[PDB]
């Protein structure tokens, strides 16, 4: 396979970032690619057996490194706001024409001002009685609002176990103030169950949003709490009526 | 200057519809051509590749022929499924070295066919841990497109399809919420053109 | 200098029979002058020639996409490279220059500067081909994409019968004859 | 019909020397100059009908250099055994007075591929007009090489080809007169 770390990262302009990649395929060649909002997938570096082959990056801003043919690491010395993208790691059997095998990607957000970073506020809203009597089904709604950047992973938990059926989470967030550049985001999600399942008081429903924010090493000098990576939830128990 | 040009913009189709993603390339070397697919939440993944000048590639019901006379590699499928929603990347690489050039990447969204629509707008509540009140527009067919709100204090999400698997049930839904007391469920989605038979319960 | 030397060699060989109709591909790794691992398109997988290459054979055969890449090499690599240079290698023809002189109980026919190496040179004495006392240097490769050869006939040098050296080469439709 | 094409590579330690060539029926199609990173065709005309990206050769040499270190450890550091060369001198045409010709010093069946070759005219070194080929492969995996000295034949001048190898105790000279 191909594994990358980190999955998400947010930092300020001028900081240093370090990404790492490992492949277990046995391949001699590894690649770093940059993927942007408009789905442009362009090459950055290519290494074959710890030797640089391709370099299409700007002259000296980056610092790739491969101690082993199975490892390929990337390092940005000073991040610009234009460095915000998804960085994908790939491997190929050797340096000739081959299939590319990609990783999950690293989502990097570079910000001018770390005080624009906010965690989400999560609320759950209980099903409508009218929907229950009209459709014999019950849908919960989860609103995650005010977060920035959109490095979140929402999930639903019924009776302590994660669920996927009956779930729809929006694929894109919506900007709260679509005019501004650093606008905070909102996100909705739905969980639809049968009305008899919601109407059982012994059933617990929880919407969980995993936010990816700052770290302990980050210096926070502001009123609110440090918006670090954290989980924010909201819950509701079933109601007989 | 190797370059690849794919279909522009996002494509949205009802399931069961044929598909065509046009891809034209341009190169002075002899290339092999690829199609990559990127499903939500994952990285890119090979669909198929064609090394030989006038041959055919196929996978997952997709198919594309490497037309060297036309310099084309159009992707086609006769009946797209909801599971085909993803981003598709056409790419070429010279046959003497791995130097892969990717196209712009066309997002394909396959919408299900809702057989028994029951459009309705419902109001929901919470434990009043929030000052918002959400409105839910659900159970409408895939024809309906929800319009984003023009009021800046009103928030409207796009339609979302969920699948209740044990029931073989699909449904579309969009959510609208606000904190102003001027906001009501009866006028939330009225920027969208919704079915005339939409059910508005007496709250 | 007296310190020890260490040599590694790799040879990717393509063998063609009746053109590209029958091709055999060989991926060959050598330590010093000893093959230790080899891929033969007739075998289909990397095999270890000596125990020195048994680590690589297990590793390479397990890599994803490897066997498919190597089992296709006769088409993607061997046959393709044949056609890239066909017009100036397989199809290269260079007519030779033939010079005849003595050396005088010894008479020599010197054929120089021809391609390819296939040649047939015979010696005639008044229409009679003397088959004894014919010595040739063999075919020597000049290293510059031309060949040459010296074929001599030790014969009584007398002012009687005419001596003709006849050469046959894939560059010429008809035999070439030089007369003494 | 019957032909053989070989892509031949090697790397030598501790000299840190490597070569990349293509062989067609015993002749060099081209080699890649590691220093300039350029493709050098054996005949200038070859470069007008074909092409090759030298970049791939440099990559292949870098893999042979790393693999050599690995293979040296596998053998428990057994070094190569020197093999002295066979040197032959000849011309490419029959020799006629005052008619231009070329001497060919052919060095054959040797390893490792490290040789000092000097053209001596009347005992004194000559490099005006000389040229040479890269190390060419052999079926027994030794090496062969060609050196050329264009000259004007005369009854006054004699020539030798001095070849220095590590399998030879002393330099090797191959003479030529007339």
């Amino acid at each position: 396979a191909v594994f990358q770390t980190p999955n998400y990262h947010v930092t300020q302009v001028g900081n240093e970032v370090s990404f790492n990649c490992k492949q277990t395929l046995g391949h001699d060649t590894m690649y770093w690619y940059k993927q942007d909002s408009k789905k442009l997938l362009k090459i950055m570096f290519s290494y074959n057996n710890k030797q640089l082959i391709v370099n299409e990056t700007v002259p000296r801003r980056f610092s790739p490194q491969s101690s082993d043919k199975a490892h390929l690491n990337l390092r940005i010395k000073s991040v610009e706001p234009e460095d915000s993208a998804v960085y994908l790691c790939a491997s190929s059997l050797d340096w000739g024409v081959n299939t590319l095998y990609f990783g999950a990607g690293t989502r990097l957000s570079v910000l001018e001002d770390l005080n624009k970073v906010f965690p989400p506020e999560v609320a759950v809203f209980e099903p409508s009685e009218a929907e229950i009597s009209h459709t014999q089904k019950a849908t919960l709604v989860c609103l995650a609002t005010g977060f920035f950047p959109d490095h979140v992973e929402l999930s639903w938990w019924v009776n302590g176990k994660e669920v996927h059926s009956g779930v729809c989470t929006d694929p894109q967030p919506l900007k709260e103030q679509p005019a501004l550049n650093d606008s905070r985001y909102a996100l909705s999600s739905r969980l639809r169950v049968s009305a008899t399942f919601w109407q059982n008081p012994r059933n617990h429903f929880r919407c969980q949003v995993q936010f990816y924010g700052l770290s302990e090493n980050d210096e926070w000098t502001q009123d609110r709490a440090k918006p670090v990576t954290q989980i924010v939830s909201a819950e509701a128990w079933g109601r007989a009526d | 200057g190797d370059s690849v040009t794919q279909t522009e913009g996002p494509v949205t189709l009802s399931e069961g519809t044929s598909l065509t993603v046009n891809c034209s390339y341009e190169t002075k070397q002899y290339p092999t051509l690829f199609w990559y697919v990127q499903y939500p939440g994952e990285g890119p993944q090979l669909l198929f590749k064609v090394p030989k000048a006038n041959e055919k590639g196929s996978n997952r019901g997709f198919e594309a022929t490497y037309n060297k006379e036309a310099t084309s590699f159009h992707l086609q499928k006769a009946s797209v499924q909801e599971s085909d929603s993803a981003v598709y990347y056409c790419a070429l690489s010279p046959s003497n070295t791995n130097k892969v050039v990717f196209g712009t990447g066309t997002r394909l969204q396959v919408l299900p066919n809702i057989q028994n629509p029951d459009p309705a707008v419902y109001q929901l509540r919470d434990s009043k841990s929030s000052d918002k009140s959400v409105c839910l527009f659900t159970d409408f067919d895939s024809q309906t497109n929800v319009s984003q709100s023009k009021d800046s204090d009103v928030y409207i999400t796009d339609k979302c399809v969920l699948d209740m698997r044990s029931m073989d049930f699909k449904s579309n839904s969009a959510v609208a919420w606000s904190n102003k007391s001027d906001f009501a469920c009866a006028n939330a989605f009225n920027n969208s053109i919704i079915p005339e038979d939409t059910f508005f319960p007496s709250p | 200098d007296t310190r020890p030397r260490f040599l590694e060699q790799v040879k990717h060989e393509c063998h063609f029979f009746n053109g590209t109709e029958r091709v055999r591909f060989l991926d060959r790794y050598f330590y010093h002058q000893e093959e230790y691992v080899r891929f033969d398109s007739d075998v289909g997988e990397y095999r270890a020639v000596t125990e020195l290459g048994r680590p690589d054979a297990e590793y390479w055969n397990s890599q994803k996409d490897l066997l498919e890449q190597k089992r296709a090499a006769v088409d993607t690599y061997c046959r393709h490279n044949y056609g890239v240079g066909e017009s100036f290698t397989v199809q290269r023809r260079v007519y030779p220059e033939v010079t005849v002189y003595p050396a005088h109980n010894l008479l020599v026919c010197s054929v120089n500067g021809f391609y390819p190496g296939s040649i047939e040179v015979r010696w005639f004495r008044n229409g009679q081909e003397e088959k004894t006392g014919v010595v040739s240097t063999g075919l020597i490769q000049n290293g510059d994409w031309t060949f040459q050869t010296l074929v001599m006939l030790e014969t009584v040098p007398r002012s009687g019968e005419v001596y003709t050296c006849q050469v046959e080469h894939p560059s010429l439709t008809s035999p070439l004859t030089v007369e003494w | 019909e019957e032909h053989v094409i070989i892509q031949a590579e090697f790397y030598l330690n501790p000299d840190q020397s490597g070569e990349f060539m293509f062989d067609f029926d015993g002749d060099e199609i081209f080699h890649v100059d590691m220093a300039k990173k350029e493709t050098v065709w054996r005949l200038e005309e070859f470069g007008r009908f074909a092409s090759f990206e030298a970049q791939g050769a440099l990559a292949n040499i870098a893999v042979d250099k790393a693999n050599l270190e690995i293979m040296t450890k596998r053998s428990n550091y057994t070094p190569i055994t020197n093999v002295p060369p066979e040197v032959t001198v000849l011309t490419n045409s029959p020799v006629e007075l005052r008619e231009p010709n070329v001497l060919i010093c052919f060095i054959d069946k040797f390893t490792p591929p490290v040789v000092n070759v000097t053209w001596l005219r009347n005992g004194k070194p000559v490099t005006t007009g000389v040229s040479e080929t890269v190390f060419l492969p052999r079926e027994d995996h030794l090496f062969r090489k060609f050196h050329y000295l264009p000259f004007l034949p005369s009854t006054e001048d004699v020539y030798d080809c001095r070849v220095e190898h590590w399998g030879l105790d002393e330099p090797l000279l191959k003479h030529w007169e007339f």
């Binding site: 000739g96 | 003497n96 | 993607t76 690599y77 056609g83 890239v84 | 791939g56 990559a59 693999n67």
Partner: peptide, 13 residues
């Protein structure tokens, strides 16, 4: 016409 090199493979460790 462009020649294609067979790539050299990295040995096991």
């Amino acid at each position: 016409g462009g020649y294609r090199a067979r790539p050299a493979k990295a040995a096991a460790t």
